[model samples]
Target: HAFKPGDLVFAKMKGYPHWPARIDDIADGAVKPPPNKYPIFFFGTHETAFLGPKDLFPYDKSKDKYGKPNKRKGFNEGLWEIQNNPHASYS
Candidate 1:
């Protein structure tokens, strides 16, 4: 029971961008060395693997060059909240 569902995690894959994963389910068993392979949700996909705590971290928001916050939304951005645009074509 190291991690429960809905916990945000990070998994690093070689040659790929860092992925922000959400815990889908924890493997059923006693915790031991190397820990357990957690079923996580990320990038519109699902998979199970042993991601160590070092591979896990709280959600890190992307920053702009000036160390400012960039809350802009992209097509695949996981955030559901929308930002207000005063000069939008239809607003």
Candidate 2:
């Protein structure tokens, strides 16, 4: 599947145990080896670049619209559009 920026992807974060993420963006110089290749990847998000070997599982909307593999509730609409999040104030 080809994913580009603005595309919705169902991915899992390192710290979040049961809650999967709808990846909004990739950090600068981010690279996912082989099996994780997708088109909609970008270089930055919320100011941090995805710096590491991260393998991502692309989201297929139709298949994930609902059910156990369902998409994250608030994130079903896609990425969040925040010019600046309050959490970034100290960074």
Candidate 3:
């Protein structure tokens, strides 16, 4: 359950506010991101960034939770300290 291009996904670093992004091309070391790192195209802000394989979490409606704010279809809690937070889920 790694990931694929054009996949809807979420990602988090060592921060509180995680991100929702669509996957773009893989990175080639020659320029910036090393081999196979995903180029993340974020919605809303419509920005872009780079993340690697172990850095991504696929978006599946079956795994999301409810939210107070506009949220990912399956991401209820949105942060750490709760269930299926995507912060540590392998898939």
Where is model 1 more than 4 Å wrong at Cα? 27-37, 60-91
lDDT per residue (tens digit) for residues 1-91 in model 3 = 6676667666655642355556765544575565667777654444567777666666554225321245544334332312333223222
> How close to the true structure is residue 10 of candidate 3, measured as C-alpha lDDT?
64
What lDDT does the true structure give each of the candidates? 0.43, 0.33, 0.53
Tens digits of per-residue lDDT, candidate 2, 11-91, equal 444542222223344444545433444333221232222322244444354224421332444332223321123122222
- TM-score list, all predictions: 0.47, 0.30, 0.54
Report the lDDT tens digits of candidate 1 across residue range 54-76.
55554444212112223423213
Which candidate number would show the highest lDDT if scored against the true structure? Answer: 3
Pairs that collide in candidate 3 are 64-74, 65-74
TM-score of 2: 0.30
Error of 3 at 31 (Å): 6.6
Q: Name the runs in model 2 displaced over 4 angstroms.
A: 18-54, 61-91
Question: Between candidates 2 and 3, which one is better according to lDDT?
Answer: 3
Better of 1 and 3 by TM-score: 3
